[PDB]
Amino acid sequence: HPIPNRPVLTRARASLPLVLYIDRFLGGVFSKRRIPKRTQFGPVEGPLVRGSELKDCYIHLKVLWFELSDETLCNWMMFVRPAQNHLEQNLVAYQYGHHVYYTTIKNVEPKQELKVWYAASYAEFV
Question: Given Cys at both, which of 41, 65, 68, 88 links 58, Cβ 3.0 to 4.6 Å?
């Protein structure tokens, strides 16, 4: 009766809150349970860069900027895809401390993909 070693995941994948999961087939982060309005995730963690040489896999975030390319160097927020209309958006991103956060603007339901875009004031900085 074997019991295998537990698979070790990239930093980005393991730093994910137990409240959420990434869905293999669909792409992106979802909620296991109800996530109420005004729930704050973060901080975004990862390498900082210039805006010069920043990729298109991701939303762009000013703090210098975040390069969210590499799972071994970022945390789970690298997986949170950028919303493309107001229908699908349920997070807003802003700077608060020395840090950047994603905050729910809707009560998010189970099996709904979390999708981010700028809070208006933050949209000014970027």
Answer: 68
